[PDB]
UniProtKB/Swiss-Prot annotation, chain A:
Changing R67A: Significantly decreases ATG19-binding and autophagic activity. One of its GO terms (cellular component) is cytosol. It comes from Saccharomyces cerevisiae (strain ATCC 204508 / S288c) (Baker's yeast). This lipid modification anchors ATG8 to membranes and can be reversed by ATG4, releasing soluble ATG8. Changing R28D: Impairs ATG19-binding and autophagic activity. Keywords: Autophagy, Cytoplasmic vesicle, Lipoprotein, Membrane, Mitochondrion, Protein transport, Transport, Ubl conjugation pathway, Vacuole. The gene is ATG8. It holds the Pfam family ATG8. This is Autophagy-related protein 8. Changing L50A: Impairs ATG19-binding and autophagic activity. Gene3D superfamilies: Phosphatidylinositol 3-kinase Catalytic Subunit, Chain A, domain 1.
Length: 111, 4
């Protein structure tokens, strides 16, 4: 049994969120950021992020970093459907290309 | 939610 975001809320309730957000926030992309299933680094229970269209991967990664007090020495990586996007990539671009049918964009992190 |  999974302990993810999809597994915690049903499709219909998830999409409900996507829409209210796309409604009450014009320039924001709703992101679900979860820890890589078999990764070792710390797991945060805060996974819902409202990100600006111009936010970059590199910047998003920096955020998750501080959030889980990652030793700058240690590494962390963000994935979008098995794809490791380049740090210059803008989240808006990634959203158009990979948003889930529920309305969210699912990202994953690890080391 | 967290606004980044």
């Amino acid at each position: 049994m999974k302990s993810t975001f999809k597994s915690e809320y049903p499709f219909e309730k998830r999409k409900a969120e996507s829409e209210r957000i796309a409604d009450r926030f014009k320039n924001r992309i709703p992101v679900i950021c979860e820890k890589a299933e078999k990764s070792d680094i710390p797991e945060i229970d805060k996974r819902k992020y409202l990100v600006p269209a111009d936010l970059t991967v590199g910047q998003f990664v920096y955020v998750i970093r501080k959030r889980i007090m990652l030793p700058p020495e240690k590494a962390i990586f963000i994935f979008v459907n098995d794809t490791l996007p380049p740090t210059a990539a803008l989240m808006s671009a990634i959203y158009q290309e990979h948003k889930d049918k529920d309305g969210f964009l699912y990202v994953t992190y690890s080391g | 939610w967290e606004e980044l």
